[PDB]
Amino acid sequence: MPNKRNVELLATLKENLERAQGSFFLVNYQGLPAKETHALRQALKQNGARLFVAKNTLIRLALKELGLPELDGLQGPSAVYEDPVAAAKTLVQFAKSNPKGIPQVKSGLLQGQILTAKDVEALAELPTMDELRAELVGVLQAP
């Protein structure tokens, strides 16, 4: 039982759980047809905005560590993510949607503090609730 240094500095480096607060965290695999998405091997000199390895290593037992509340997007645990630039700019910089560029990227599970589901359709399709919040300055009660 080495528990090889492949798990040791790649078991999170306890990072992104405490880095770019370790929640909102969500969907979408360790890899499928390698042509398209991208800033794959291009996030300026690192892959600080992607991940490297190991579904069995960390996710099975890593632990509860470092949070924000519950859950649930679409589904549950098999393969996940890493970034600081979540739901709004999570999708003007990566992972467009439905199906995608390449052939239709697939699946994962989330947990932030905004109460609800899917994480694909309404939250993650270049939704400019930044440029449609100068719409609220007179809405819902005013004369």
Added chain:
Amino acid sequence: MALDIERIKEELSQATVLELKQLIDALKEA
């Protein structure tokens, strides 16, 4: 000038900040 107080006082987070929070208060009030 004031595209910079109204594009940067709401990008204390590029993501859900007050950003996703008057989508949830346009939601709460009719």
Added chain:
Amino acid sequence: MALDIERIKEELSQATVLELKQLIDALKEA
């Protein structure tokens, strides 16, 4: 900053940055 950060930060400074910041330096915007 949803629940209480700007729930009543309004009751103290009401009618002074709301009858301003729709028709003052929201005047200055974009």
Added chain:
Amino acid sequence: AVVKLQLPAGKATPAPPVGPALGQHGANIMEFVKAFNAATANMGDAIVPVEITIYADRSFTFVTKTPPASYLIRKAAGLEKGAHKPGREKVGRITWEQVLEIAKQKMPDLNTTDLEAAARMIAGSARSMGVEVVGAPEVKDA
């Protein structure tokens, strides 16, 4: 996929292997022996890559993003007309002055941009050619 070249220094040569073999390749070759001929014109021979693409039909694609790995080598760097028995003799020795930022041209695409990257990439057929040249006198850890 669809890849080959056109070269060497200037006065492009569509020879029996370098451009008359454009049949079931792209075939609009009267005006596009001239729209590449300013994209390898007035640069100088050391390698000068050629990027060529695929289509549904017949013409009009891109050229190149960088000529590295022996080019910014044998202009003035490393004095590397790196003679036969490729050289454990110092056929020419340098530092990272005509290697590191002679080409920040490298930065378009080798997937790592910050310069211990495509700098030391192109010090592959330059630096480790027998005389592994030097980047410093070896930083002095402390």
